[PDB]
Amino acid sequence: KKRKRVVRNNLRIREDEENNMNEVGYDDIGGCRKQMAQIREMVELPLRHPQLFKAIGIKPPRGVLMYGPPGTGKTLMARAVANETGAFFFLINGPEVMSKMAGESESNLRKAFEEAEKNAPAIIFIDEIDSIAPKRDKTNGEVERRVVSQLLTLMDGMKARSNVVVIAATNRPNSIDPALRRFGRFDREVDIGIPDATGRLEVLRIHTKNMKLADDVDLEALAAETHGYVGADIASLCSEAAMQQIREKMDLIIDAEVLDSLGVTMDNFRFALGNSNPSALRETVVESVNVTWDDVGGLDEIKEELKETVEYPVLHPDQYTKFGLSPSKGVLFYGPPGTGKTLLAKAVATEVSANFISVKGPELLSMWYGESESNIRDIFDKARAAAPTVVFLDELDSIASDRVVNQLLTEMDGMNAKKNVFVIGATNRPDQIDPAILRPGRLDQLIYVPLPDENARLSILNAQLRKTPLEPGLELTAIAKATQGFSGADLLYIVQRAAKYAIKDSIEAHRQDPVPYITKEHFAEAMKTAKRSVSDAELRRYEAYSQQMKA
Amino acid sequence: DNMLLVDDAINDDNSVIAINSNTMDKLELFRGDTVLVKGKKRKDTVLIVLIDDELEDGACRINRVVRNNLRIRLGDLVTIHPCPDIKYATRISVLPIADTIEGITGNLFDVFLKPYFVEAYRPVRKGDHFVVRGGMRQVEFKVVDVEPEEYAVVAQDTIIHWEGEPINREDEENNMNEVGYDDIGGCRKQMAQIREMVELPLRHPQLFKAIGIKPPRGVLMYGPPGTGKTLMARAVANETGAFFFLINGPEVMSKMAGESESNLRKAFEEAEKNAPAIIFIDEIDSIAPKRDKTNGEVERRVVSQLLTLMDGMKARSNVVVIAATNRPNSIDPALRRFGRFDREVDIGIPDATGRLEVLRIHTKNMKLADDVDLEALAAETHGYVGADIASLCSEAAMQQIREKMDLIDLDEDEIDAEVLDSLGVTMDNFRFALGNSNPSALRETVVESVNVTWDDVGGLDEIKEELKETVEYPVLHPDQYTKFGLSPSKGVLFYGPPGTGKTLLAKAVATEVSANFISVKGPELLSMWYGESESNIRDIFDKARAAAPTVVFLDELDSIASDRVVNQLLTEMDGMNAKKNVFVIGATNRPDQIDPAILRPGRLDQLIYVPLPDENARLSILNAQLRKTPLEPGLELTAIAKATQGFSGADLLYIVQRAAKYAIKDSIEAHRQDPVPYITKEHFAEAMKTAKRSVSDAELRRYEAYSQQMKA
Ligand SMILES: Nc1ncnc2c1ncn2[C@@H]1O[C@H](COP(=O)(O)OP(=O)(O)OP(=O)(O)O)[C@@H](O)[C@H]1O
Numbered sequence A: 001k002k003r004k005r006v007v008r009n010n011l012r013i014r015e016d017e018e019n020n021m022n023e024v025g026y027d028d029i030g031g032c033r034k035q036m037a038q039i040r041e042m043v044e045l046p047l048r049h050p051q052l053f054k055a056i057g058i059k060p061p062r063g064v065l066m067y068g069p070p071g072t073g074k075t076l077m078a079r080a081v082a083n084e085t086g087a088f089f090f091l092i093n094g095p096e097v098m099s100k101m102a103g104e105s106e107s108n109l110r111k112a113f114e115e116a117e118k119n120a121p122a123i124i125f126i127d128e129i130d131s132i133a134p135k136r137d138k139t140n141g142e143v144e145r146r147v148v149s150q151l152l153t154l155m156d157g158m159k160a161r162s163n164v165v166v167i168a169a170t171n172r173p174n175s176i177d178p179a180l181r182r183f184g185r186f187d188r189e190v191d192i193g194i195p196d197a198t199g200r201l202e203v204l205r206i207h208t209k210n211m212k213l214a215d216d217v218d219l220e221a222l223a224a225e226t227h228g229y230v231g232a233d234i235a236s237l238c239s240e241a242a243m244q245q246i247r248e249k250m251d252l253i254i255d256a257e258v259l260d261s262l263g264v265t266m267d268n269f270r271f272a273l274g275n276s277n278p279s280a281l282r283e284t285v286v287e288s289v290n291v292t293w294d295d296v297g298g299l300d301e302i303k304e305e306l307k308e309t310v311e312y313p314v315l316h317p318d319q320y321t322k323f324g325l326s327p328s329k330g331v332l333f334y335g336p337p338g339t340g341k342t343l344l345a346k347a348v349a350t351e352v353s354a355n356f357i358s359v360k361g362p363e364l365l366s367m368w369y370g371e372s373e374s375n376i377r378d379i380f381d382k383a384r385a386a387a388p389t390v391v392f393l394d395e396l397d398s399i400a401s402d403r404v405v406n407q408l409l410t411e412m413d414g415m416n417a418k419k420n421v422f423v424i425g426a427t428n429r430p431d432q433i434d435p436a437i438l439r440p441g442r443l444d445q446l447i448y449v450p451l452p453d454e455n456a457r458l459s460i461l462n463a464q465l466r467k468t469p470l471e472p473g474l475e476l477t478a479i480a481k482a483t484q485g486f487s488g489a490d491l492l493y494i495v496q497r498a499a500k501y502a503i504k505d506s507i508e509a510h511r512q513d514p515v516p517y518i519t520k521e522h523f524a525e526a527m528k529t530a531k532r533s534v535s536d537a538e539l540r541r542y543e544a545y546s547q548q549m550k551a
Numbered sequence B: 001d002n003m004l005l006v007d008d009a010i011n012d013d014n015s016v017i018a019i020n021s022n023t024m025d026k027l028e029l030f031r032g033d034t035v036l037v038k039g040k041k042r043k044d045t046v047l048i049v050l051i052d053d054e055l056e057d058g059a060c061r062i063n064r065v066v067r068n069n070l071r072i073r074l075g076d077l078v079t080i081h082p083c084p085d086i087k088y089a090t091r092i093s094v095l096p097i098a099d100t101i102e103g104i105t106g107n108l109f110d111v112f113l114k115p116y117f118v119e120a121y122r123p124v125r126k127g128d129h130f131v132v133r134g135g136m137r138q139v140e141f142k143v144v145d146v147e148p149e150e151y152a153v154v155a156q157d158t159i160i161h162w163e164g165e166p167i168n169r170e171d172e173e174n175n176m177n178e179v180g181y182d183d184i185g186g187c188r189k190q191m192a193q194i195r196e197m198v199e200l201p202l203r204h205p206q207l208f209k210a211i212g213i214k215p216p217r218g219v220l221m222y223g224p225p226g227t228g229k230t231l232m233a234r235a236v237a238n239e240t241g242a243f244f245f246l247i248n249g250p251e252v253m254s255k256m257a258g259e260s261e262s263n264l265r266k267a268f269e270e271a272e273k274n275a276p277a278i279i280f281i282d283e284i285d286s287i288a289p290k291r292d293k294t295n296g297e298v299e300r301r302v303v304s305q306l307l308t309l310m311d312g313m314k315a316r317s318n319v320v321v322i323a324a325t326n327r328p329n330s331i332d333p334a335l336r337r338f339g340r341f342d343r344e345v346d347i348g349i350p351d352a353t354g355r356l357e358v359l360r361i362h363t364k365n366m367k368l369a370d371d372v373d374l375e376a377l378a379a380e381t382h383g384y385v386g387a388d389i390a391s392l393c394s395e396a397a398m399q400q401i402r403e404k405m406d407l408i409d410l411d412e413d414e415i416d417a418e419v420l421d422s423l424g425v426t427m428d429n430f431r432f433a434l435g436n437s438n439p440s441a442l443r444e445t446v447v448e449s450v451n452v453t454w455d456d457v458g459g460l461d462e463i464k465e466e467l468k469e470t471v472e473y474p475v476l477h478p479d480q481y482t483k484f485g486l487s488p489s490k491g492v493l494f495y496g497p498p499g500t501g502k503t504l505l506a507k508a509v510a511t512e513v514s515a516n517f518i519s520v521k522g523p524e525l526l527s528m529w530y531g532e533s534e535s536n537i538r539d540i541f542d543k544a545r546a547a548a549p550t551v552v553f554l555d556e557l558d559s560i561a562s563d564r565v566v567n568q569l570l571t572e573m574d575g576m577n578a579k580k581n582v583f584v585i586g587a588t589n590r591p592d593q594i595d596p597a598i599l600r601p602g603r604l605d606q607l608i609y610v611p612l613p614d615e616n617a618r619l620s621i622l623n624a625q626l627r628k629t630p631l632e633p634g635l636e637l638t639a640i641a642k643a644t645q646g647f648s649g650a651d652l653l654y655i656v657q658r659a660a661k662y663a664i665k666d667s668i669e670a671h672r673q674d675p676v677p678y679i680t681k682e683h684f685a686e687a688m689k690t691a692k693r694s695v696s697d698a699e700l701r702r703y704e705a706y707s708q709q710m711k712a
């Protein structure tokens, strides 16, 4: 393996060894099984077995291009695949080549390409290819027009029939000159999103393989609580926890006995999480959700309609092809705020096992005003790249000009119907929605979301209270019955208020477990201190609009 | 207990230390061998030990000169070790000090060679100062160099060299190459954090290897300009004792292209050679500014070279990089990612104790007059960073010079020393200098500590308890919330009549949890909206995160209800993680223009009405103001409180101020024509006759209706 206890170490199955951080195989990467498989398919076969392509008679693809949030291990993934396949790895940095003189950058590039070619089982991993080749309409300088031209000439002049694979990494997909996306160049696109719970647990296990972890570790709990953390953030969290442990042990301070007492505890991880701050949520990213249909309460007919709309076309594409009906993709939820529309969207995305994409109203406004990292083009491009995907547009009424609406219409119409990309819009103000978006071939289907009934309210209360202690024998049927006209947000507020009262009483009792659960009287006080958040006028308006649509 | 207590010595011998036999017994030292005494700031010396039965056990006898050389004072603890590697000196180079040879010429080296080194075998070390008597003078020389290393003893056959020129004495003191922790004050927390982030990687690298982790390398301290960042960096570097290397942003950026890369590469390589080492930078923003505004290629290549050097740093090497920047967000964001500058430290304006400590440090050499009340200056000086305090001291000294100048004649080239002896800075000089100061830190959002308690709050007990339950518990008792799973709320918004004590409530809340208050007025938000202001709300929240726990205060939040700033605030507040100890308190007199999105869950959801003070509240407020102005004995404030229905705190304070003004005017008239240094009944009578209300009843009814609507 890798072209290689003492024998096992020799065959890999004083600083010069550890500092030489190589041989990082597939073991040291987690949460990217799909992308790992894609990269392996596009790399190993062209290099290990070029004979197969000759047998089938077709040129193997070469141009690969990865993009995702910064610090997600793109460089680490490329290094790992290069080491696993056993080929020579050449690394290039965009700013570095841009750093050198006007003519020096072109030299560097051509010399690197030729050196790879002469020694060319290898991967020429560019990095931050956007910097060297930014958008043409933005920068049109002499050096900008020269270095990009040289790179394009080198790419077009690829000798072919060789074992050279070029990989480029850019944080944003549509942040490069489009000239690189044509045939014979970077075409095989790969998207890396924030890892899910399993990926985060894998990363935690990978990193915490040398640290003297204490006896009490519940890494599953850490994975569950940590959301929106990229691998770099997890590494930083582990480092912060170790630093906190060192600080805690420092009060008593070296004798080896104390060194023997070093141990990272759950308190350290909690403190590190407190000190950590993810930098990935601020950008639109693709992830996987696991919301079950049984998770929500009621809305059985809505579930049936959404199933008919999404599941059958994707579960049984052959039936639709034979019947000739193209899959529907325009779904728009409307109804009172806080009715769990996002939860329904997440359930729908989980049904087809697609990657859910979320774009909120503040993001829409930021794009509208021009101050925003990403534009709708990038959102839809990523949606296509990570197909299948379900895009969610929250508060379409918040774009109340029409530039963003026009861009959205163009993007929605341009994408091919066959591609499994669905768009789900949510808005509590259907009147304000531009009529142009309701046209056929667009967000045409309308789904009203009625308020939960007593059964739905009881189910919501039961689900929300599963993870918190409750007084044995408590009957929530009365609570649900006495909560007519409410919504999910109101029930959540009631639960939070009851928990707050319980916390206050517990703290006072401890100062003076006396009460490790919430009593019926606490819920009674919470409900008496809270009331409905939606007036009858709004419900009447919703009903009138529903009648108008029906008629 | 090998440490021994520093003791004053009557004898003037510069190489003899007299100790009791029990002192040797503790360390089992043998008579006839020198000992190494090490003090502080990497200062050490070698002394010949003698036995003095008179001295009690543990009592030493070292002249004042050796202690001065070691930079130590009486009563300190110094570590004493034997000298197993005693060696003699073969070639010692020593040069004189010109100011020490004033009044007598000639070469005293030959005079001192034989009598002073007649088989004496005095131990010698680099940098020592030794005093020898020649003629009528006692001249002190310095040990320029000694061979073989490291310290050795002055043997008779040792060759002494004197080919050179004298050097100044104060030049070494002003070199700034020796500054310990004693030369800093008011930054205990930040200094402790820097020590924890620096000492452990260098002093004890084995800890990280034992626990299996890569120690951090990137420490970035940012704060208002002229706050002492460079001084703190130099102090920590010298205290650690490791090799040091500095890079100035202005210097590197001032050289033509290409030379900068060579300088950076040479600096990094040389520092790596002398591991352990510390690399420091200044105005890193200057060399790596915000790429969004500067598109020049030179800065791009410089920043790329710096990034390459940082990333290529070898895994195991005792090198720590420190950077300084006034604006935390000004630097190119690429430097903030993992594996680079990540350990962020924020330095705020010092509080009263910090200002007192700084003033004490600076006023360590001036001829302070007998009447100085540095406590009063510390209390009065608010918003002064250390540099402003140094400028204040300089200006006060200059004013004293102005006052004393008339006696002397500046035309002559010589000034009599008797007048010089009379120089002395009086409290009036400091008062004038403070009058002619120009603080600037307070003009921009800077984290500062507050010391306001519930006592200053005149009533609103129920609001006090509600706010306590909302804030204090999640800050001091997160365990209960974790057990129940309820997340802590952060968004609290006060609404009510102006001047009802909202800022004071926010300050009290911030003080209770012992957090760093941050203030952001509405005009600042407007200027940020127009872009004229330097700092952006992103910077405010980044500073709040770095200085956590903190309480941010947004006054006149309705002034932006503009939409870009509101959207940015919503985005940043959403990005904030709940578990972090960051809280936001909004204030506004018009709780109707605020966008509904501000009131959404996970945002400024908690609403608190602030009512006008009650009669008991009015009495408490009046008592609170009347603490430094003397009052007529027997004066009754109940009549004023009861006749001041509907008044606000600001109105009561204004009434007190105008009454004090009337009393002062009466005193001025009486003196011109201070038997009455206090206020009497007539002044309060006039003030109440001139009383009014800041809020009309219609506005009160509107607020009441709005509060009832919110409650329903
Ligand atoms: N499976 C993983 N996914 C993400 N990060 C990982 C993973 N395994 C380890 N890491 C850690 O996360 C970081 C990923 O590598 P690195 O810091 O080079 O990020 P990157 O996104 O590839 O970098 P860049 O985009 O600048 O080339 C490293 O700290 C690596 O140790």
Ligand SMILES: Nc1ncnc2c1ncn2[C@@H]1O[C@H](COP(=O)(O)OP(=O)(O)OP(=O)(O)O)[C@@H](O)[C@H]1O
Binding pocket: B183, B184, B185, B186, B224, B225, B226, B227, B228, B229, B230, B231, B282, B283, B324, B358, B361, B385, B386, B387, B390
């Ligand atoms: N404890 C202290 N805290 C702050 N300033 C101090 C302190 N002691 C002395 N000073 C004064 O502060 C100044 C030293 O800090 P300096 O001017 O280098 O700060 P800076 O603005 O961070 O520097 P830089 O030019 O490196 O950005 C001198 O005026 C010194 O007299």
Ligand SMILES: Nc1ncnc2c1ncn2[C@@H]1O[C@H](COP(=O)(O)OP(=O)(O)O)[C@@H](O)[C@H]1O
Binding pocket: A295, A296, A297, A298, A336, A337, A338, A339, A340, A341, A342, A343, A426, A452, A456, A460, A487, A488, A489, A492
């Ligand atoms: N079956 C359900 N119906 C309505 N709301 C639910 C249901 N299940 C959970 N919820 C709650 O609904 C909330 C979603 O709130 P919100 O985003 O305001 O709704 P929307 O996105 O539809 O406007 C979640 O916090 C969740 O706890």
Ligand SMILES: Nc1ncnc2c1ncn2[C@@H]1O[C@H](COP(=O)(O)OP(=O)(O)O)[C@@H](O)[C@H]1O
Binding pocket: B456, B457, B458, B459, B497, B498, B499, B500, B501, B502, B503, B504, B613, B621, B624, B648, B649, B650, B653
């Ligand atoms: N409980 C209180 N209510 C109102 N004012 C008070 C109270 N305690 C003290 N004050 C005084 O009232 C004034 C309030 O000023 P400020 O905090 O700016 O008010 P606001 O935030 O309402 O504008 C200050 O002089 C303050 O010392």
